[PDB]
Amino acid sequence: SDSRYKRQVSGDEAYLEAAPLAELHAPAGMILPVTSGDYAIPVTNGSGAVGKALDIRPPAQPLALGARTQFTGDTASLGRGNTLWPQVVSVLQAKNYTITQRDDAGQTLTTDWVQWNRLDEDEQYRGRYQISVKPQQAVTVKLLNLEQAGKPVADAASMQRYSTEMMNVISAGLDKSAT
C-alpha cells in the first residue's frame, strides 16, 4: 500500500524513451510528397511534469454550500449574512489550529504551520495560510507556504487542493455553527 498508484497513470512509462522527430531533407531537383498532416505537433516548450510525476488526481473546485465559489489561486472565495467576522476565528479555534500572527483590524489573520492529513497522499503535507474578509461579505483564504516531508512545493496542482482543503475546514466550521 504505497498509495502512489492513485496519483499516477495506469500504463507504463515507455513512451518517454521514444526517439525525437527529425524531418527529411529533400534532394536537389525534387521534393518530398506533400503533405496532409493531419498529424502535427506544434512547438510547445515544457515545462510541466511527465510520466508518473504528473498528478492525475481530479482537480478541486469545492465546496460551495448563497453557494457558488469564484475562481482558484493563490486565492479562495466564499447574498450573505449580517455581520460578525470573528465567527471565522471561533471556528478556527474550534479545530484547535495554532494561530501566530493576529490582527483584528482588517478582519485578517495568518494561520500557522499546523500540518494537514490525506489518505491518497504519499508522504504528507502542511502549510501556513492567510484569512481575510473584504466587504456583502466574502471570506478569502490564500497561502504562502508548502511542505512535503519538509520540501517546498510551488506547483499549481497541489495549490488548488490544499487551498481548498483549508477552505473546506473554514466552510465546515462556519457551515456547522451558522446553521
Partner: protein, 90 residues
C-alpha cells in the same frame, strides 16, 4: 535446395490493362480521358513530377512473373507529353 517447390496462390498486382484498351491512348489526352477507360492509376508520381504508372503484374502458381509497365508523362497543363510502354521484363 529448391529446384522445384509448392505451394503458392496467384498474386496479381497492378492496374488491369487488356492490351487493346492500351491501344485507346493517344497523344493529346487531357489526363481526364486517360482515366476514362484505363483506370485511376494505382501508382502515380511522387516526387515533384507528373507521370501515371500503369503496371500489370501477375505471379500465378510458381510459374513466373509477367508484368508490362506503361508509364505516361504529362505536362503542367494536364496533357500527356510522353508514352513509355515496356512489356515483360529482363
Amino acid at each position: 535446395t529448391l529446384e522445384r517447390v509448392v505451394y503458392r496462390p496467384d498474386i496479381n498486382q497492378g492496374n488491369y490493362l487488356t492490351a487493346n484498351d492500351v491501344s485507346k491512348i493517344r497523344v493529346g489526352m487531357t489526363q481526364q480521358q486517360v482515366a476514362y477507360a484505363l483506370g485511376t492509376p494505382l501508382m502515380s508520381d511522387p516526387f515533384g513530377t507528373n507521370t501515371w504508372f500503369y503496371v500489370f503484374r501477375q505471379q500465378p502458381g510458381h510459374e513466373g512473373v509477367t508484368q508490362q509497365t506503361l508509364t505516361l508523362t504529362f505536362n503542367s497543363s494536364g496533357v500527356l507529353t510522353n508514352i513509355d510502354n515496356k512489356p515483360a521484363l529482363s
